């Protein structure tokens, strides 16, 4: 789920 | 961007190649993509004309029940077609595939004896052999030479069963006292799409010769040639299907390897090919 | 003719014969010709050099066996003629070929020349009054009191799935494969060789066939029993010695569901059945899946029904009812159907006259058949 | 425009399969808004490319593509040199080359020629891959055709490391043409898609590639059998229904006899 | 089996051997004076030559018809009542049981091996039998290398020299943990 986590990580930071 | 002329050209390209018994939803799809009926219709008239021309579609005449075939040979040009059974000129709406205004048209009738004898014998034959078997016979003067054209067509559509099929056999036959020539083209188009897709397109060309002594005798000989040609063609198709898995299909993928045993994947992975020595 | 007709089901392995209207064939014997291979030295040895029927079984070790039919196709026609005259011999069905019409049963999708030569033999060498050739599966469905359903007839030479709807077998939906009980017996012979038991003799092939019949089964899961070490079950040979069979008990019949275990480019029996069902229009498919009738000897394997059910369920569409019917009279079901068909007075209109055969020939017998 | 997407998909499924590429390109010019989406759904015959470093034929797909470049499976380099690219991995690259060798052997055994290409990529607690096979019919014999097969497999590795779950989806595009004396010309196109799931014990004796290859060959054999038997015998039946070799008078007589037989059977039950 | 048949025929010629040590003398007689006639029926009807063989003790024996009828057992097992295929039948049935595509190249590539293939005239006789059984317009090439006795050992030596042989053997630990299954998967 690393690709999924990174997309969420961009959203969480912004 | 795309020019509208190119748009309707692609629309005609898709329309003319539609499989038999599915032109209506192909048309529905092409308008739904274009979203322009008025823009489409001018070239769509030519596209539908050609599709219904080369496909030999049968259209019923309500007042006659002749059920004549639409063919390039029996075309007049006022969006009208001449049924040689009873000599009836009728307008044909390609959009609805409907016959209107049955109008007698005066032909000289020089070839009517040959045309009618061939039509009678050919109807007897088509009813004997085909399932539905809609047929017509025309007379023409090609390059000044008198010719009789037999057209046979048999269609079976079951979109409920996910399959359509069409047989169409055209046979030109020139009149010549010493020896006459017969030239035939047979086309079969079958589509079947239940949880998959398969499209058979078969074509055959035949050439033979006959002798012209009596019109009834010549017509009987012609129908015997039709019998022999179509019987041998259909039996050849059946045999070709029988030898599909053995030889024809084997050129692409074999049912089993040449070793006649399933691949031992552990063997090939762990050990090399084993052809290091030579 | 007002005399009683005789039904003959000439299978590859066993040939059933009997007067029509009987509930059972009383004259079934193996379909091979035995010839003595040892040299006769005394005055008073067994007379004759051809041994067919129970005599061939009594003196089995004395004879070399030859099978005239292979995969439902008559390879040796002289031996077939000898067997068909033995059917009329005084040992079994003491009668004359001239007195009784014959209902011959034949495998489906056979070559044209086979039917032609069978008709020629029955009309010329035998002066038979009336012959009718039929199929093996449609009769097997007639036996079980049905007219719609799919028959999976698995005999000794050939196994075929035939869907019949309202009596008339669909000629286009017939499925046939040549791996059958004989191939399973050969595979069992090879595996027994791999246990340290050689049965290369022709008479020992019948002992291998008996071992197949009496001690074999089909495992529910192939790999599960393949990996598990099976208990060694001991079988008693005719001489009195014993052999430990072991894994060859279940590896042998697995040929039926995996033809690639002997390098045959063909489909399995479950695939054959499911393809026969799916080759028909869908409205009848749901009825065909319910009405599945097993037939032939090879369907009698211990656990055949369960494995076939599992495989057909694995292949068939989900949410479709599947029911396998296994009649107790599976061996004689085809003959029972032949007897039922011959009992009908309409059979009087279904046979071919000697005058009709002389006039037309194979055209008459092939237009009379389906 | 989901309705127009379904329209385009149905139309493309309806058109002949040999002209799939040209007609798809033409249709792209009509409604370009869904074109890439169409290219994601519509299945197309594969393209061959020359890996010059090793000198091999490799198949171009959408999974190895990166922008306007295609990654070779042997060289592990894009045919257009990309300064930045997505290599699969270190371990998955060894899995990829092992799969390439294994499927080269499988292709040689089953097809005797053609080209093959296995491309792997990682996945959520697992890895996915695509196995592409192409095989154009040789011109030595009158039979001329093409076989394309795309098998996308998804491997979910269980936490224990011994068990795994495989989900295989296979598409086969077949085309055959024969020009014989009797048949004159026969042209059998077709396409067929199937799917199946399984779970297998990963081990040194039974690694991942063995399981994927076993599933792929089982699916290929099943698809070949179905195409040869059901989807071609149905066309045979249709051609036999369009015209009858036997006359209809004889058929009517046989059917009357059959009606007599079935009524007689129905009476005795 | 050929040497046992030769012992039986020598018994039928008056020269009787019982002992297990004298079976080795019979084996030596087979290896020394025995040949395969190209035409068995032609040589059968003709008068024999009766070549003399010197036994280890110094006595002599006249062989005659047993010289060529003993290796005949390879091509005709029915001479001892076995209903099994002959050696030529073994070869041809192995070729014809294979794929139809491979039959031509299998006929074009036949390799003899083992000690019993060293009989005088073995190659010509087998070629004649295979040609009798094989289809026409198929080239037949039976290869008879000089190292027939040690061909299989030389093959084992070639295989064991490769580095791939490391990946082929059943290790000791593998047998310890699995047992017969390790050899069962690794051999096949
Ligand atoms: N209980 C059984 N288990 C397994 N096989 C059997 C059994 N009984 C009979 N057979 C096999 O079935 C075959 C006979 O089946 P049958 O229906 O008579 O075939 P055919 O129709 O060709 O005569 C024999 O070869 C025999 O080996
Ligand atoms: N020159 C020869 N002529 C005939 N037979 C021979 C000859 N040399 C050896 N043999 C036979 O070949 C056998 C040995 O063959 P070999 O290849 O060693 O068998 P194996 O494969 O069991 O080792 C012996 O029994 C011997 O009788
Ligand atoms: Mg039977």
UniProtKB/Swiss-Prot annotation, chain A:
> Lineage of this protein's species?
Eukaryota, Metazoa, Chordata, Craniata, Vertebrata
Complexes and interactors: Homodimer. The cytoplasmic dynein 1 complex consists of two catalytic heavy chains (HCs) and a number of non-catalytic subunits presented by intermediate chains (ICs), light intermediate chains (LICs) and light chains (LCs); the composition seems to vary in respect to the IC, LIC and LC composition. The heavy chain homodimer serves as a scaffold for the probable homodimeric assembly of the respective non-catalytic subunits. The ICs and LICs bind directly to the HC dimer and the LCs assemble on the IC dimer. Interacts with DYNC1H1; DYNC1LI1 and DYNC1LI2 bind mutually exclusive to DYNC1H.
Instruction: Report the superkingdom from the record.
Output: Eukaryota
Q: Which organism is it from?
A: Homo sapiens
Name the chain's protein. Cytoplasmic dynein 1 light intermediate chain 2
Q: Where in the cell is it found?
A: Cytoplasm, Cytoskeleton
The text of the family note is: Belongs to the dynein light intermediate chain family.
Q: What does this protein do?
A: Acts as one of several non-catalytic accessory components of the cytoplasmic dynein 1 complex that are thought to be involved in linking dynein to cargos and to adapter proteins that regulate dynein function. Cytoplasmic dynein 1 acts as a motor for the intracellular retrograde motility of vesicles and organelles along microtubules. May play a role in binding dynein to membranous organelles or chromosomes.
UniProtKB/Swiss-Prot annotation, chain C:
Gene Ontology cellular component list: cell cortex; centrosome; dynactin complex
**Where this protein primarily resides, as one coarse class?**
cytoplasm
Q: Which compartments is it annotated to reside in?
A: Cytoplasm, Cytoskeleton; Cytoplasm, Cytoskeleton, Microtubule organizing center, Centrosome; Cytoplasm, Cell cortex
**Per UniProt, which keywords does this protein have?**
Acetylation, ATP-binding, Cytoplasm, Cytoskeleton, Nucleotide-binding
Recorded GO molecular functions are: ATP binding
* CDD domains in alphabetical order: ASKHA_NBD_Arp1
Record has Nucleotide-binding as a keyword:
yes
Q: Cross-referenced InterPro entries, in alphabetical order? A: Actin (IPR004000), Actin/actin-like_CS (IPR020902), ATPase_NBD (IPR043129)
Name the SUPFAM superfamilies for this protein. Answer: Actin-like ATPase domain
**What does the similarity note say?**
Belongs to the actin family. ARP1 subfamily.
Annotated function: Part of the ACTR1A/ACTB filament around which the dynactin complex is built. The dynactin multiprotein complex activates the molecular motor dynein for ultra-processive transport along microtubules.
Record's subunit section: Part of the ACTR1A/ACTB filament around which the dynactin complex is built. The filament contains 8 copies of ACTR1A and 1 ACTB. Interacts with dynein and adapters such as BICD2. Interacts with BCCIP (isoform 2/alpha).
Protein's name in the database: Alpha-centractin
Organism of origin is Sus scrofa (Pig)
Q: What is the lineage of its organism?
A: Eukaryota, Metazoa, Chordata, Craniata, Vertebrata
Swiss-Prot record, chain D:
Per the similarity annotation, which family is this?
Belongs to the F-actin-capping protein beta subunit family.
The entry lists its GO molecular-function terms as: actin binding
Keywords, ordered alphabetically = Acetylation, Actin capping, Actin-binding, Cytoplasm, Cytoskeleton, Phosphoprotein
InterPro entries named among the record's database cross-references: CapZ_alpha/beta (IPR037282), CapZ_alpha/beta_2 (IPR042276), CAPZB (IPR001698), CAPZB_N (IPR043175), F-actin_capping_bsu_CS (IPR019771)
Annotated function: F-actin-capping proteins bind in a Ca(2+)-independent manner to the fast growing ends of actin filaments (barbed end) thereby blocking the exchange of subunits at these ends. Unlike other capping proteins (such as gelsolin and severin), these proteins do not sever actin filaments. Plays a role in the regulation of cell morphology and cytoskeletal organization. Forms, with CAPZB, the barbed end of the fast growing ends of actin filaments in the dynactin complex and stabilizes dynactin structure.
Question: Which domain of life does the protein's organism represent?
Answer: Eukaryota
Q: Which gene encodes it?
A: CAPZB
* Protein localization: Cytoplasm, Cytoskeleton; Cytoplasm, Myofibril, Sarcomere
- List GO terms (cellular component aspect): F-actin capping protein complex; sarcomere; WASH complex
Name used for this protein in its record: F-actin-capping protein subunit beta
Q: Could you list the residue ranges that cross the membrane?
A: none
**BP GO terms, sorted:** actin cytoskeleton organization; barbed-end actin filament capping; cytoskeleton organization; regulation of cell morphogenesis
Give the modified residues of type N6-acetyllysine. 234
From Swiss-Prot, chain E:
Location of the protein in the cell:
Cytoplasm, Cytoskeleton; Cytoplasm, Cytoskeleton, Microtubule organizing center, Centrosome; Cytoplasm, Cell cortex
The entry describes its oligomerization and partners as:
Part of the ACTR1A/ACTB filament around which the dynactin complex is built. The filament contains 8 copies of ACTR1A and 1 ACTB. Interacts with dynein and adapters such as BICD2. Interacts with BCCIP (isoform 2/alpha).
State the similarity comment: Belongs to the actin family. ARP1 subfamily.
Task performed by this protein: Part of the ACTR1A/ACTB filament around which the dynactin complex is built. The dynactin multiprotein complex activates the molecular motor dynein for ultra-processive transport along microtubules.
Official protein name in the record? Alpha-centractin
| Record organism | Sus scrofa
